[PDB]
Amino acid sequence: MKEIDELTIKEYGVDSRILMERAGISVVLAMEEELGNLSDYRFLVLCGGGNNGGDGFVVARNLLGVVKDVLVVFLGKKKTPDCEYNYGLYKKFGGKVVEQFEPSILNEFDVVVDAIFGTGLRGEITGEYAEIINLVNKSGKVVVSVDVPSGIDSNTGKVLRTAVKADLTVTFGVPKIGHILFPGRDLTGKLKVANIGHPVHLINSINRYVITREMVRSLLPERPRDSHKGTYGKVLIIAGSRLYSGAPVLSGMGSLKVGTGLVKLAVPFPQNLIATSRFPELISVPIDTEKGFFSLQNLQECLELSKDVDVVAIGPGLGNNEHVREFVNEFLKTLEKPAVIDADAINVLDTSVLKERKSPAVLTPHPGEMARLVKKTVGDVKYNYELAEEFAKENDCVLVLKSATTIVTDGEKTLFNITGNTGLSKGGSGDVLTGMIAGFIAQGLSPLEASTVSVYLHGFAAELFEQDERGLTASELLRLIPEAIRRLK
Amino acid sequence: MKEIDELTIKEYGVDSRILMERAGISVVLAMEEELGNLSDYRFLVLCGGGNNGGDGFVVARNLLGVVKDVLVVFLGKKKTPDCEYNYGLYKKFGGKVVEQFEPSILNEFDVVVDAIFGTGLRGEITGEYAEIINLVNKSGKVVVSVDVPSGIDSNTGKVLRTAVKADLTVTFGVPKIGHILFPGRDLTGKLKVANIGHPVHLINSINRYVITREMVRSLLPERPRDSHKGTYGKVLIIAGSRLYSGAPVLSGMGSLKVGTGLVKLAVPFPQNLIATSRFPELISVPIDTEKGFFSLQNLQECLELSKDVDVVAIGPGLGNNEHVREFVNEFLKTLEKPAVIDADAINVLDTSVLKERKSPAVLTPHPGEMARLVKKTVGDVKYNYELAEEFAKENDCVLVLKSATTIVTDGEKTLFNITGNTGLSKGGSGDVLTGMIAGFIAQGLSPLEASTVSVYLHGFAAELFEQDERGLTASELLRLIPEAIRRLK
Amino acid sequence: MKEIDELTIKEYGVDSRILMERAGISVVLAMEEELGNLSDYRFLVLCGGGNNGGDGFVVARNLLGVVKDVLVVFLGKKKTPDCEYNYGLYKKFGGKVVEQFEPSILNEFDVVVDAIFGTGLRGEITGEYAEIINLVNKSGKVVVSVDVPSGIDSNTGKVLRTAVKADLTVTFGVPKIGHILFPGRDLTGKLKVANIGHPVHLINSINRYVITREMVRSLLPERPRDSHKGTYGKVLIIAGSRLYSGAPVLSGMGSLKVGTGLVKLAVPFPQNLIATSRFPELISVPIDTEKGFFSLQNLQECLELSKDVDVVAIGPGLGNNEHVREFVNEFLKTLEKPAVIDADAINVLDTSVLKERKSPAVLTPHPGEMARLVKKTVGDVKYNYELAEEFAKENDCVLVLKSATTIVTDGEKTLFNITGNTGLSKGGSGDVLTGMIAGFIAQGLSPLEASTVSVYLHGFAAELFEQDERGLTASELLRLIPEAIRRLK
Amino acid sequence: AWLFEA
Amino acid sequence: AWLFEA
Amino acid sequence: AWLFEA
Amino acid sequence: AWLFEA
Ligand SMILES: NC(=O)C1=CN([C@@H]2O[C@H](COP(=O)(O)OP(=O)(O)OC[C@H]3O[C@@H](n4cnc5c(N)ncnc54)[C@H](OP(=O)(O)O)[C@@H]3O)[C@@H](O)[C@H]2O)[C@@H](O)CC1
Ligand SMILES: NC(=O)C1=CN([C@@H]2O[C@H](COP(=O)(O)OP(=O)(O)OC[C@H]3O[C@@H](n4cnc5c(N)ncnc54)[C@H](OP(=O)(O)O)[C@@H]3O)[C@@H](O)[C@H]2O)[C@@H](O)CC1
Ligand SMILES: NC(=O)C1=CN([C@@H]2O[C@H](COP(=O)(O)OP(=O)(O)OC[C@H]3O[C@@H](n4cnc5c(N)ncnc54)[C@H](OP(=O)(O)O)[C@@H]3O)[C@@H](O)[C@H]2O)[C@@H](O)CC1
Ligand SMILES: [K+]
Ligand SMILES: [K+]
Ligand SMILES: [K+]
């Protein structure tokens, strides 16, 4: 986007001042749409000395004479050329600027336009800038941020000491990663993406994206009328143990509910019986184990079951011990089918195995599992999209790193999912998603496409829950999947 | 409240007669709000010779000339000063008083205002007072009680031989315990609490309270968007036996339905399988027991499971035998986590164990269990809030004594819950509440706060049942919990 | 009302402080009803040093702890006993009082409670009191006046230099004349009359009243089913001239539209033909005049027409010249029927004629006509209810002095009409009312009753006009009369 | 109507 | 709510 | 109304 | 949708 601006100015020939005018008027129109008629309100515009403040001067100038009151507090020590030109127009148009901020100033205004820092923020905010941002955050006024709430790092979504909490953020051309990852996503409030005149070709060239309704609609597999269960593929789910007898059921129904033709589970006896007592449409094959866990003695039987399926999901509820580790790694080394690898299969995984595999794989860790897998702290991997890109690329896989914003990447293309709510922050919700993914692969979507569609729908199903989100359980999520599909078309 | 009146008069300087006038007019406004326009009705005001009757004379005087008819039956033998002043105004204003009550008197009136005894009731009602109260209770007229239905002991809610059954009770300043505990709660009918001019500081200083919607709303834990299952805590429930295989499922779903991140049950094999056949989102760990019950041989395994959780609930469906007693007491003595202790863990509990424990505990008995625990009769412990306060204080715990009105106390603060209906008078409903409490503790509420929020919501969920309350079962209650949460906000 | 308070305290025995408490709490309840929940608002209570300020201290004290903020500005130099007691309670309860008023004070409050002067106002407001009232009137805050907006003379409704303009006024016991006459009626805003505990017998003894819906409903004549046009009486209207050919039509239809059996007009030929060309249900008798005006040569014919009627209306559109004067005075001297005397019959009237008449009369002047009749200025007679009472008493008549508030009096009983709008401030509207009155007399109501019912209905008909009131014309008013009747029942 | 007339 | 709580 | 009058 | 995406 730095790149996009520069090319639009220097190669396409659009005056920087035209882009700036277009930015500012977008903010005015975005505010009107959100607040209704503006003429009743008093506006306090806070401008830094870079181009973010320049956009703010455009805003302020365009409100002169049309609203109850405008005042600009200019907080910078010097001005970029466009900021200066715009500051000049604001004053020629009769605008009032002050350079000193007093805490009672907020008392006489209804809306704060935050044009202090955008993408040019570097390092922590301290000193007056910070005292001002804290005052705004305590004031309870309506806050509108230009481009990015000041203090959010636009490439990571991290808070650089302190940051503005906005009701509305107006961003230019494309969402920034910092609007999509948390905490930034939270401080952004309602986000509007304004077209300010960049050539559409450049806007489209952007290689990291938000998964949208339209993109999911066009990836959903076709349901031709003349079809049968084989049309829609076969999944095998290798899951469960004497400790975790429910996980397999959640994964199997996840596959069935997204439209898979036939789902079989391989679960240790007698735990396999639990699945068909709840959902008799599932096939649940009993595996004779020694101690209640899968081990090498089960390798041959599971490779046999694998011949008649299109995809195998493995890991939910397996347990994390030596015999499971030996089994999971020998199985995956020999399986010549697409594999969806979750949960305890990730906790015991030898990543050398992924490299030597010809068939594709999707891994679906949460950050605690990802942390253990690559030997880093949870805080080093969380929202770390470059680490995820590098891991996918090195291991030839699709990585689905689950969190409130989920990252889906194969190393070349990275997508961000923002559907969902905290009802998914509960055990079982991941086991459902694993089956969804396996299911869409069985129906013929690629591993990356299956993952894209599944995280969206899984999040959207949670949002359709009728009661308070915290009471949402995995079983109820399963029941909402087909409504999410219907609403998606 | 005796204290509150005295301070408001003697230290704040409010004339006793002003408080009395304010009391009486509250009753008139409360009646109008309930009956609509008063001018059509005929009023029979029954006044004793204390300040309760004084309020009644205020009422009667304020109806003169505005309603179809007013008559006062004065039943006392002498009058307090304010009662006398007010009696004087009633007569100067043209009011009719009689001192002899005749059973046909009721025939010619539509509304009985009961101002015989309020908080000054002492000992049993006998003689004429009683014959009159029985006549009123047989009459089918509309009955409005001033302060407290006459015959209810305002500190206990007990009936002192006989008591008025009111359609409407208007109380002053604060609800009295006798409006909150049964049978008094029942005789009160619809209760209105009138502000009669006490300083708000004094009204607020009152140390025993009704759990309200607002208080529960502000205790509900936050659901930040950037969260995961660990944000919302981990519960272990140690429950069940060969005789009681369903109780654990009810407790575990209670935890999940209030928003807990991860719930594990430890239940004797194969009974542990029942839970995931109904609710596969639950984790249900098989415990190898000798005879179908927990015992000392299971101590080490359960202490191990306890290390990875935030709270442990214990007792539902354990059985009451020697091996369970040994196990429960050694476990609790060694567990260094908050404990929620219910049902059969209470029936075998050695209360010395609670004293020596560093970690907190909540006990949730019904009165039959409380009776056995402190070695008293059911009738001595039922609604005995001072006994509960003393037990909580002595044993350093929170005591939740369940009944139609439930008492929650830690020895310093005591709260009363009035949500619910008779659908909760059915086995299983307590097992749900235990999981709710454990769940809110896991989410970070204190033991007293968790208990406050849980009894309210558990009662409110029951009231949301669509069909007749008597057909409500524990499973249906579970399904209503998230609707109660939503309605609470 | 001065009398009413004193008797209630000194003879009935109600403590002055009880009346004051009741006054103050009325204001709080009146505000809640108008503003909804009060707890969001900040209140500035302005208190003088009399009992009006005493009521204000009651208000302020009762808001402590329940609303966002209360402050009292005490503007007096000393305090009456009740004001002092109440000031004492306000402070003991933690209330803040200041004695110095600063113009920015208004900035931090939402509602001004005006308790500066009530009925104790004497002479003009000047000095600080005035500067404060002007500040409040410029502030655009919500203004609630205790008893009477400060600066209105409660006995006349005149403004004593300056006065508060209230959104809401709460008055005690009865409306005061100053709420009913203008300009006071205008400054009062919405008026609520609170019962503060006076005996109803005293409230009722008040000899000047507002004409209400209920009083008009019970005066409306009966329409027995077995009836005929003679049941409902006969009117003769002597009206019109070569200059004013429409007035008679308006008066005649006024009689017919209120339910009169038979209406005849006596109008100079050919102007009499105009009436039946518009309304052929009217009888319009041609009177042969010399020059287009009634004169002595028409005396005998009009006395003949008078024998067969129950009431005669005279004056609308007659013209004011010598021949009309001679005719009107000889006619009225000889007519032995009830007479309704309007317009130009009033302008030529010799008032000695009213004295010598045995039959009753109603006069319906506007203030310009009343002024000429008693030889005073318009400003001396306007809203001068004592002058009207004296004129009615001396001349044995009913006087209906028309204005936005109309005064109806026979010298003993005086009533005030407040229905209507400025659509009646247009020629023709009086000519309608004259026929209405004549019509109700013909139906058997007394002259005072006929006048009471007519001014109410005439004003109410105007309020039922569908479009903007200024476009209302006499013909449209006629059409609304029967809807007003229907709505009145 | 017990408290207020309008 | 100034007069009554329910 | 900021952009357009009609 | 020409000006804004949401
Ligand atoms: N009904 C059933 O049968 C269910 C069965 N299930 C089965 O349980 C098995 C274990 O799975 P798991 O995620 O609980 O532990 P694991 O993979 O070892 O995690 C590593 C550590 O990371 C942490 N941590 C946990 N979540 C986190 C997060 N979102 N983001 C960040 N950190 C997080 C947590 O650490 P702690 O909280 O202890 O610090 C944890 O120990 C798995 O096979 C699953 O399928 C579950 O699906 C539930 C329903
Ligand atoms: N589906 C399942 O798996 C269920 C399993 N459950 C499991 O059953 C176990 C036993 O629990 P419990 O309450 O039945 O007997 P206990 O604690 O010994 O009570 C002592 C005595 O008090 C009486 N009494 C009973 N209730 C009372 C009351 N509300 N108020 C006053 N008195 C009362 C009654 O005496 P009785 O009626 O015989 O005179 C009773 O004998 C427990 O572990 C529980 O979790 C149950 O939750 C049901 C669903
Ligand atoms: N369509 C028809 O045929 C109509 C015919 N009509 C017939 O016209 C005749 C004259 O009636 P009238 O009221 O116009 O004059 P009159 O009685 O001499 O008044 C004395 C002076 O007082 C003034 N003044 C006027 N109104 C006032 C007021 N409300 N309050 C206070 N002051 C007021 C005004 O003075 P000015 O404005 O000139 O200063 C006026 O000169 C009458 O017979 C009527 O029936 C009218 O009804 C209209 C429709
Ligand atoms: K910004
Ligand atoms: K009572
Ligand atoms: K006043």
Coordinates of N, CA and C in Angstrom, one line a residue, chain B residues 148-210:
Chain B
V148 N -46.2 -5.2 56.1 CA -46.0 -6.6 56.1 C -47.4 -7.2 56.4
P149 N -47.8 -8.2 55.6 CA -49.1 -8.8 56.0 C -49.1 -9.2 57.5
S150 N -50.1 -8.7 58.2 CA -50.3 -8.9 59.6 C -50.2 -10.3 60.0
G151 N -49.3 -10.6 60.9 CA -49.1 -12.0 61.3 C -47.9 -12.7 60.8
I152 N -47.2 -12.0 59.8 CA -45.9 -12.5 59.4 C -44.8 -11.9 60.2
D153 N -43.9 -12.7 60.8 CA -42.8 -12.2 61.5 C -41.7 -11.7 60.5
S154 N -41.4 -10.4 60.6 CA -40.8 -9.7 59.5 C -39.3 -10.1 59.5
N155 N -38.8 -10.7 60.5 CA -37.4 -11.1 60.6 C -37.2 -12.6 60.1
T156 N -38.3 -13.4 60.1 CA -38.2 -14.8 59.8 C -39.1 -15.2 58.6
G157 N -40.2 -14.5 58.4 CA -41.2 -15.0 57.4 C -42.1 -16.1 57.9
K158 N -42.0 -16.4 59.2 CA -42.9 -17.4 59.9 C -44.3 -16.7 60.1
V159 N -45.3 -17.6 60.1 CA -46.6 -17.2 60.4 C -46.9 -17.4 62.0
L160 N -47.3 -16.4 62.6 CA -47.5 -16.4 64.1 C -49.0 -16.6 64.4
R161 N -49.3 -17.9 64.4 CA -50.6 -18.5 64.4 C -51.5 -18.3 63.2
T162 N -51.8 -17.0 62.8 CA -52.4 -16.8 61.6 C -52.0 -15.5 61.0
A163 N -52.1 -15.3 59.7 CA -51.6 -14.2 58.9 C -52.5 -13.9 57.8
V164 N -52.5 -12.6 57.4 CA -53.3 -12.1 56.3 C -52.6 -12.6 55.0
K165 N -53.4 -13.0 54.1 CA -52.9 -13.3 52.8 C -53.3 -12.1 51.9
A166 N -52.2 -11.4 51.4 CA -52.4 -10.1 50.7 C -52.3 -10.3 49.2
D167 N -53.1 -9.6 48.4 CA -52.8 -9.4 46.9 C -51.6 -8.5 46.6
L168 N -51.5 -7.5 47.5 CA -50.4 -6.5 47.3 C -49.9 -6.1 48.7
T169 N -48.6 -6.0 48.8 CA -48.0 -5.5 50.0 C -47.1 -4.4 49.6
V170 N -47.3 -3.2 50.3 CA -46.4 -2.1 50.2 C -45.5 -1.9 51.4
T171 N -44.2 -2.1 51.2 CA -43.2 -2.0 52.3 C -42.3 -0.8 52.2
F172 N -41.8 -0.4 53.3 CA -41.1 1.0 53.2 C -39.6 0.9 53.3
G173 N -38.9 1.6 52.4 CA -37.4 1.6 52.5 C -36.8 0.3 51.9
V174 N -36.9 -0.8 52.5 CA -36.3 -2.0 52.0 C -37.2 -3.2 52.2
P175 N -37.1 -4.2 51.3 CA -37.8 -5.5 51.6 C -37.3 -6.0 53.0
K176 N -38.2 -6.7 53.7 CA -37.9 -7.3 55.0 C -37.7 -8.8 54.7
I177 N -36.9 -9.4 55.6 CA -36.7 -10.9 55.4 C -37.9 -11.7 55.3
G178 N -38.9 -11.2 56.0 CA -40.2 -11.9 56.0 C -41.0 -11.8 54.7
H179 N -40.7 -10.9 53.8 CA -41.2 -10.9 52.5 C -40.5 -11.8 51.6
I180 N -39.3 -12.3 52.0 CA -38.4 -13.0 51.1 C -38.3 -14.5 51.4
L181 N -38.5 -14.9 52.7 CA -38.6 -16.3 53.1 C -40.1 -16.7 53.2
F182 N -40.3 -18.0 53.0 CA -41.6 -18.6 53.0 C -41.9 -19.0 54.5
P183 N -43.1 -19.1 54.9 CA -44.4 -18.8 54.1 C -44.6 -17.3 53.9
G184 N -43.9 -16.4 54.5 CA -44.2 -15.0 54.4 C -44.2 -14.5 52.9
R185 N -43.3 -15.0 52.1 CA -43.1 -14.6 50.8 C -44.4 -14.9 50.0
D186 N -45.1 -15.9 50.4 CA -46.3 -16.3 49.8 C -47.5 -15.4 50.2
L187 N -47.5 -15.1 51.5 CA -48.6 -14.3 51.9 C -48.5 -12.8 51.5
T188 N -47.3 -12.4 51.1 CA -47.1 -11.0 50.7 C -47.7 -10.6 49.4
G189 N -47.9 -11.6 48.5 CA -48.5 -11.3 47.2 C -47.5 -10.5 46.4
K190 N -48.0 -9.5 45.6 CA -47.1 -8.7 44.9 C -46.5 -7.6 45.8
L191 N -45.2 -7.5 45.8 CA -44.5 -6.6 46.7 C -44.0 -5.3 46.1
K192 N -44.4 -4.1 46.6 CA -43.8 -2.9 46.2 C -43.0 -2.3 47.3
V193 N -41.8 -1.8 47.0 CA -40.9 -1.2 48.0 C -40.9 0.3 47.7
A194 N -41.4 1.1 48.6 CA -41.6 2.5 48.5 C -40.5 3.3 49.2
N195 N -40.0 4.3 48.5 CA -39.1 5.3 49.1 C -39.9 6.2 49.8
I196 N -39.8 6.3 51.2 CA -40.5 7.3 52.0 C -39.7 8.4 52.6
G197 N -38.5 8.6 52.1 CA -37.6 9.7 52.4 C -36.4 9.4 53.2
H198 N -36.1 8.2 53.6 CA -34.9 7.8 54.3 C -33.7 8.2 53.4
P199 N -32.6 8.7 54.1 CA -31.4 9.0 53.3 C -30.9 7.7 52.6
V200 N -30.6 7.8 51.3 CA -30.1 6.7 50.5 C -28.9 5.9 51.1
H201 N -28.0 6.7 51.7 CA -26.8 6.1 52.5 C -27.3 5.1 53.5
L202 N -28.4 5.3 54.2 CA -28.8 4.4 55.2 C -29.5 3.1 54.5
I203 N -30.3 3.4 53.5 CA -31.0 2.3 52.8 C -29.9 1.3 52.2
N204 N -28.8 1.9 51.7 CA -27.7 1.1 51.2 C -26.9 0.3 52.1
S205 N -26.9 0.7 53.4 CA -26.0 0.1 54.4 C -26.5 -1.3 54.8
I206 N -27.7 -1.7 54.4 CA -28.4 -2.9 54.7 C -27.7 -4.1 54.3
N207 N -27.3 -5.0 55.2 CA -26.3 -6.0 54.9 C -26.8 -7.4 54.3
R208 N -28.1 -7.5 54.2 CA -28.7 -8.7 53.6 C -29.6 -8.3 52.5
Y209 N -29.4 -8.9 51.3 CA -30.1 -8.4 50.1 C -30.6 -9.5 49.2
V210 N -31.6 -9.1 48.4 CA -32.1 -9.8 47.3 C -31.2 -9.7 46.1

